[PDB]
């Protein structure tokens, strides 16, 4: 079977302008495991990102946590961009500043 | 109820270049303590478990057992032919129970669908698809494989689980309460969305609810995910009429709080 | 026609029952004490019927069939005994061989913490036999190759210590020194026996006999070679039997060997007279520890017989092991202060030289300088221990262990930190055990003790191997193990661990530990640093460890400790990368 990723974007600590923090992109519920994730700062890919091990849930679907150190400011927009066999084109989710 | 040790195993038949054909994550309840992949070939501790007060050869025993499973999983693809690509997953582990008893788990899935298990009283792999039979016989015909699987689930897993409970108790009994924020934003015309957010908490069990005039206003719509250190994030959103935002508050329940915490709108 | 009746008569019921209890505790280390006493008592009741009538049912069966059969009544529980359960599906002799493969050289069994003297003395008084059986059970299950007849002697001295001290005025001042001496003798005794068993089982009778020839020649230099060889053959059967789990035969034959020796002192040694007047168990123990006899006053040089004489290749070819044996015997009797493992290296070197040269064009020329080859074999060990004892006295115990920890992580980065920490602790004890000896005895002490630490490493690595270089050093040749490990350079095939945001993930629980407990954390960190850069210098490593210690100090004083740890861990990661030069 195939399963399309769910994508959430959120910070590790409550965001405050000018304070170091981490930004998460959590992609879950997908199958097969091949997937492409980029974190973006004002549309540009962030190089200094890391991720957790690809693991999976009881329903056998995969999940994966990407994250990057960042210092949010009022002006900057951050986003996560995901491609997967189940998607015709990359899906971009914007950081909602913890207000969906 | 009872916390368990489970191994999440995956093998893929056509890995992207420079990515592992086989990899394992090991979990003590909701915490990942173990990582293994076929490119590196050793099992290694994760996170705070690097510092666990552990016995000599514990980790080389984890490495030894997963190398055997690595080969078995890759052999399974040979027993299939078909055409592929294939994904083979296994969930193997145990959970402690009553009268100092262990309950094992041994399930497998192919390209995302469960198709096979290991019967621990009989020591056999079984399933109904042609693929379960093909893989199960190939494994059955492997000298000592069923014996090693029996020992892995009936002996090693519960012994590992009991050791980590004693020696990793600081990690298992970690408590970190959420930092809370309540925010509103406009939505459809005449409506606003209220979002109650919980940052950096452990353990993962958490409830968010909205109140108005001290009485239940609703749970809202929620989501949930991990941070890199194995703490968690959660949020819940409620749609309300514009102008009513300040009438609502958010209440959170978590093991890390002396009592439910009420959270008020921020401007 | 009945071995169980035969062994029961030779040994007597008390020693029979004690050895049978030891046997079960060593095979089934996880089994509760009361189950073992029931089984030992049943076999012994059974044993009594075979003496009464050497023909009653099952009295004709082999010892391994009888004992194995009982074990497989309970050892069928895979939950408790692991892969051992697979042994009960097979027949003798493989069933027995399978059980020996699964003897656990590292049982994870609770430390045995000593109670107060008064509580133990009451337990002793309340039920003396049960108290002493418990002593055998606890020692045997933690040391499944403990030399069983010697364990009997430990138990007798342990019983004697309680008998005397629990009636003394200062009980603890009488008792605790005595229990500590036995505790310490037992691990040493246990470690040596583990090495004897590894040589017989992994290398074979010839390798063991070479060791015994050398050692007996040191202690009994006035005996003729024919008498030593006889003693070596006797002793080889004893240890073969103990190491094969044949404990009743081992003890029986060891007693016979002890009587032969005492009935032939004039052919063996002048130090045996009083020993040979002691009781049975004490007699055997005294003989094994007796001081070396004096060597003959004026011995010729070895040149005549083994280098210059022209028959060497003639004598060698018709009985190579007797000739190499005679060389070992002559070299060993002249050098009671050489370590035996070094002597065996000399003899193996000599063997290697004669194999090539006795094939050669002019044999006498080819091997005329063979004794020169011994000088480097003596020089390397002596220099090793001079520097290490120099290092040990400058640095002290804890920092010396840390130096070896770094050294061995570089050598075997595939081992886990707990394994490396424990190896370095054991190696470091060779420091304080031997470096305090007189100059001349420092090197023999060390080669012997290091050979027992490495064997303990090797027998565990064999069960769960992770370094090909370790497998090579452990299986290549018993006598060259220590030089092989010394020569290991930093392992450049090891792919370093990568740094990431979670490399130093701590919780607030580390702030509540004792500094002793903190020490293993620092050591574990030191392993992890090496694994992130195997070629790191001492200076890079000290800098990163100093950062580590400040990180712990900063966050454990902090108002929000868990939060401090989340915020500073990744800062420590970046600081650590820089310290190591990335
Ligand atoms: O050395 C040996 C043994 C070798 C055997 S072996 O198998 O080959 N063992 C080994 O090789 C072990 C070596 C260890 C291995 C070495 C390997 C080393 C490798 C090193 C290099 C490699 C490094 C190793 C590293 C390992 C490794 N592996 N991987 N990495 N590392 N043997 C020595 C010599 O051989 C034997 C010599 O034989 C000589 C002999 O024959 N001896 C005889 C002598 C007789 C004797 O004394 N016997 C006694 C018996 C006791 C006794 O008291 N007997 C007397 C009682 O008899 C009665 C006599 O008295 C009665 C009496 O009163 N009167 C007699 C008179 C009769 C008249 C007869 N007349 C005559 O004879 C003359 S005629 C005169 C007329 O003019 C009456 O009865 O009436 C005894 O000693 O027991 C002997 O028997 O011993």
Swiss-Prot record, chain A:
Single GO MF descriptor: MHC class II protein complex binding
Domain Ig-like C1-type stretches: 5-93
Annotated localization: Secreted; Cell surface
Pyrrolidone carboxylic acid modified-residue sites: 2
GO cellular component: a single term: focal adhesion
Residues that span the membrane, as ranges: none
Chief site of localization: secreted
Any coiled-coil regions, as ranges: none
GO annotation terms (biological process): amyloid fibril formation; antigen processing and presentation of endogenous peptide antigen via MHC class I; antigen processing and presentation of exogenous peptide antigen via MHC class II; antigen processing and presentation of exogenous protein antigen via MHC class Ib, TAP-dependent; cellular response to iron ion; cellular response to iron(III) ion; cellular response to nicotine; intracellular iron ion homeostasis
Keyword terms, alphabetized: Amyloid, Amyloidosis, Disease variant, Disulfide bond, Glycation, Glycoprotein, Immunity, Immunoglobulin domain, MHC I, Pyrrolidone carboxylic acid, Secreted, Signal
Keyword Secreted: yes
Disulfide bonds: 25-80
Domain of life (superkingdom): Eukaryota
Family, similarity comment: Belongs to the beta-2-microglobulin family.
Function according to Swiss-Prot or TrEMBL: Component of the class I major histocompatibility complex (MHC). Involved in the presentation of peptide antigens to the immune system. Exogenously applied M.tuberculosis EsxA or EsxA-EsxB (or EsxA expressed in host) binds B2M and decreases its export to the cell surface (total protein levels do not change), probably leading to defects in class I antigen presentation.
Annotated disorder: Immunodeficiency 43: A disorder characterized by marked reduction in serum concentrations of immunoglobulins and albumin, and hypoproteinemia due to hypercatabolism. Patients may suffer from recurrent respiratory tract infections and severe skin disease.
Entry protein name: Beta-2-microglobulin
Organism of origin: Homo sapiens (Human)
UniProtKB/Swiss-Prot annotation, chain B:
GO annotation terms (biological process): IgG immunoglobulin transcytosis in epithelial cells mediated by FcRn immunoglobulin receptor; immune response
Subcellular location: Cell membrane; Endosome membrane
Annotated region (Alpha-1), positions in chain: 1-85
Region (Alpha-3): 176-265
Tissue-by-tissue expression: Expressed in full-term placenta, heart, lung, liver, muscle, kidney, pancreas, and both fetal and adult small intestine.
Membrane topology listed for this record: Single-pass type I membrane protein
GO cellular component: endosome membrane; external side of plasma membrane; extracellular space
Subunit structure: FcRn complex consists of two subunits: p51, and p14 which is equivalent to beta-2-microglobulin. It forms an MHC class I-like heterodimer. Interacts with albumin/ALB; this interaction regulates ALB homeostasis.
Protein name: IgG receptor FcRn large subunit p51
Span of the entire protein shown here: 26 to 292 of 365
Curated annotation (Swiss-Prot), chain C:
Localization per record: Secreted
Effect of residue 372 to N: In Nagasaki-2
Glycosylation sites (chain numbering): 9, 48, 134, 159, 196, 222, 230, 273, 278, 310, 314-315, 320, 348, 375, 410, 436, 441, 491, 522, 531, 533, 542, 570
Residues binding (4Z,15Z)-bilirubin IXalpha, per UniProt: 237
A GO CC annotation given for this chain: platelet alpha granule lumen
Modification sites for N6-methyllysine: 531
Residues modified to Phosphoserine: 2, 55, 62, 270, 416, 486
Binding-site residues for Ca(2+) 2, renumbered to this chain: 10, 252, 256
Site (Aspirin-acetylated lysine): 196
CDD domains linked to this entry: ALBUMIN
Disulfide partners: 50-59, 72-88, 87-98, 121-166, 165-174, 197-243, 242-250, 262-276, 275-286, 313-358, 357-366, 389-435, 434-445, 458-474, 473-484, 511-556, 555-564
Residues bearing PTM N6-succinyllysine: 202, 433, 516, 561
Entry comment describing in which tissues the protein is expressed: Plasma.
Mutagenesis / variant outcome for changing residue 266 to G: In Nagasaki-1
Keyword Calcium attributed: yes
Subunit structure: Interacts with FCGRT; this interaction regulates ALB homeostasis. Interacts with TASOR. In plasma, occurs in a covalently-linked complex with chromophore-bound alpha-1-microglobulin with molar ratio 1:2 and 1:1; this interaction does not prevent fatty acid binding to ALB.
Protein name: Albumin
Taxonomy of the source species: Eukaryota, Metazoa, Chordata, Craniata, Vertebrata
Gene: ALB
């Amino acid at each position: 079977i195939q399963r399309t990723p769910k994508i959430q974007v959120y910070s590790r600590h409550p965001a405050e302008n000018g304070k170091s923090n981490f930004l998460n992109c959590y992609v879950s519920g997908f199958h097969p495991s091949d997937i492409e994730v980029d974190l973006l700062k004002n549309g540009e890919r962030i190089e200094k990102v890391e991720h957790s091990d690809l693991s999976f849930s009881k329903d056998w679907s995969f999940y994966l946590l990407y994250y990057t150190e960042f210092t949010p400011t009022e002006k900057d927009e951050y986003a996560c961009r995901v491609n997967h066999v189940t998607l015709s084109q990359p899906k971009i989710v914007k950081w909602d500043r913890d207000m969906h | 109820s009872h916390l368990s040790l489970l191994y999440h195993l995956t093998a893929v038949s056509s890995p992207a270049p420079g990515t592992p054909a086989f990899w394992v994550s090991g979990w003590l309840g909701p915490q990942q303590y173990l990582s293994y992949n076929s490119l590196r070939g050793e099992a290694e501790p994760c996170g705070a478990w690097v510092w666990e007060n552990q016995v000599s050869w514990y980790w080389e025993k984890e490495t030894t057992d997963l190398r055997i499973k690595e080969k078995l999983f890759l052999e399974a693809f040979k027993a299939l032919g078909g055409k592929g690509p294939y994904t083979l997953q296994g969930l193997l582990g145990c959970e402690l129970g009553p009268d100092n008893t262990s309950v094992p788990t041994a399930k497998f899935a192919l390209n995302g669908e469960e198709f096979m298990n290991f019967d621990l009283k009989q020591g056999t792999w079984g399933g109904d698809w042609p693929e379960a039979l093909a893989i199960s016989q190939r494994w059955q015909q492997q000298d000592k494989a069923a014996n090693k699987e029996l020992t892995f689930l009936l002996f090693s897993c519960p012994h590992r689980l009991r050791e980590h409970l004693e020696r990793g108790r600081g990690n298992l009994e970690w408590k970190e309460p959420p930092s809370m924020r309540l925010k509103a934003r406009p939505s459809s015309p005449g409506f606003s969305v209220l979002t109650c957010s919980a940052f950096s908490f452990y353990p993962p069990e958490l409830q968010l609810r909205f109140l108005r005039n001290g009485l239940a206003a609703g749970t809202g719509q929620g989501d949930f995910g991990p941070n890199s250190d194995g703490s968690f994030h959660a949020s819940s959103s409620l749609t309300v009429k514009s102008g009513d935002e300040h009438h609502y508050c958010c209440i959170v329940q978590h093991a890390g709080l002396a009592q439910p915490l009420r959270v008020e709108l921020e401007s | 026609k009945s071995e169980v009746a035969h062994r029961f008569k030779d040994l007597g019921e008390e020693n029979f029952k004690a050895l049978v209890l030891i046997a079960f505790a060593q095979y089934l280390q996880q089994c509760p004490f009361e189950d073992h006493v029931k089984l030992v008592n049943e076999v012994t009741e059974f044993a009594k019927t075979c003496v009464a009538d050497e023909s009653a049912e099952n009295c004709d069966k082999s010892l391994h069939t009888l004992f194995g059969d009982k074990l497989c009544t309970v050892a069928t529980l895979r939950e408790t005994y692991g892969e051992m359960a697979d042994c009960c599906a097979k027949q003798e002799p493989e069933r027995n061989e399978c059980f020996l493969q699964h003897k656990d050289d590292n049982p994870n069994l609770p430390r045995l913490v000593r109670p107060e003297v008064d509580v133990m003395c009451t337990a002793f008084h309340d039920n003396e036999e049960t108290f002493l059986k418990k002593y055998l059970y606890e020692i045997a299950r933690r040391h499944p190759y403990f030399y069983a007849p010697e364990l009997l002697f430990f138990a007798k001295r342990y019983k004697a210590a309680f008998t005397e001290c629990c009636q003394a005025a200062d009980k603890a001042a009488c008792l605790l020194p005595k229990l500590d001496e036995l505790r310490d003798e037992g691990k040493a005794s246990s470690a040596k026996q583990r090495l004897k068993c590894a040589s017989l089982q992994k290398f074979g009778e010839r390798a063991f006999k070479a060791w015994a020839v050398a050692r007996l020649s040191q202690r009994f230099p006035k005996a003729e070679f024919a008498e030593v060889s006889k003693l070596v053959t006797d002793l080889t059967k004893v240890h073969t039997e103990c190491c094969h789990g044949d404990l009743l035969e081992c003890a029986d034959d060891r007693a016979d060997l002890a009587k032969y020796i005492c009935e032939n002192q004039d052919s063996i040694s002048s130090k045996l007279k009083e020993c040979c007047e002691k009781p049975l168990l004490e007699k055997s123990h005294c003989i094994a520890e007796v001081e070396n006899d004096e060597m003959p006053a004026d011995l010729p040089s070895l040149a005549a017989d083994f280098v210059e004489s022209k028959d060497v290749c003639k004598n060698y070819a018709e009985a190579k092991d007797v000739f190499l044996g005679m060389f070992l015997y002559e070299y060993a009797r002249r050098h009671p202060d050489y370590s035996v493992v070094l002597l065996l290296r000399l003899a193996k070197t000599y063997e290697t030289t004669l194999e090539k040269c006795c094939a050669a064009a002019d044999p006498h020329e080819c091997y005329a300088k063979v004794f020169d080859e011994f000088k480097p074999l003596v020089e390397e060990p002596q220099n090793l221990i001079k520097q290490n004892c120099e290092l040990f006295e400058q640095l002290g115990e804890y920092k010396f262990q840390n130096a070896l920890l770094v050294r061995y992580t570089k050598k075997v980065p595939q081992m886990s930190a707990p394994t490396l920490v424990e190896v370095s602790r054991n190696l470091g004890k060779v420091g304080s055990k031997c470096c305090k000896h007189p100059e001349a005895k420092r090197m023999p002490c060390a080669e012997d003790y290091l050979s027992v630490v490495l064997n303990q490493l090797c027998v565990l690595h064999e069960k769960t191997p992770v370094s090909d270089r370790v497998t090579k050093c452990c299986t290549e040749s018993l006598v060259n193990r220590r030089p092989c490990f010394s020569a290991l350079e930093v392992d450049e095939t090891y792919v370093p661990k990568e740094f990431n945001a979670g490399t130093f993930t701590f919780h607030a629980d580390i702030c509540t530990l004792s500094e002793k407990e903190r020490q293993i954390k620092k050591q574990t960190a030191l392993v992890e640093l090496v694994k992130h850069k195997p070629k790191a210098t001492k200076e890079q490593l000290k800098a990163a460890m100093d950062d580590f210690a400040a990180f712990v100090e900063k966050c454990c004083k902090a108002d929000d400790k868990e939060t401090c740890f989340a915020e500073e861990g990744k800062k420590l990661v970046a600081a650590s990368q820089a310290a190591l030069g990335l």
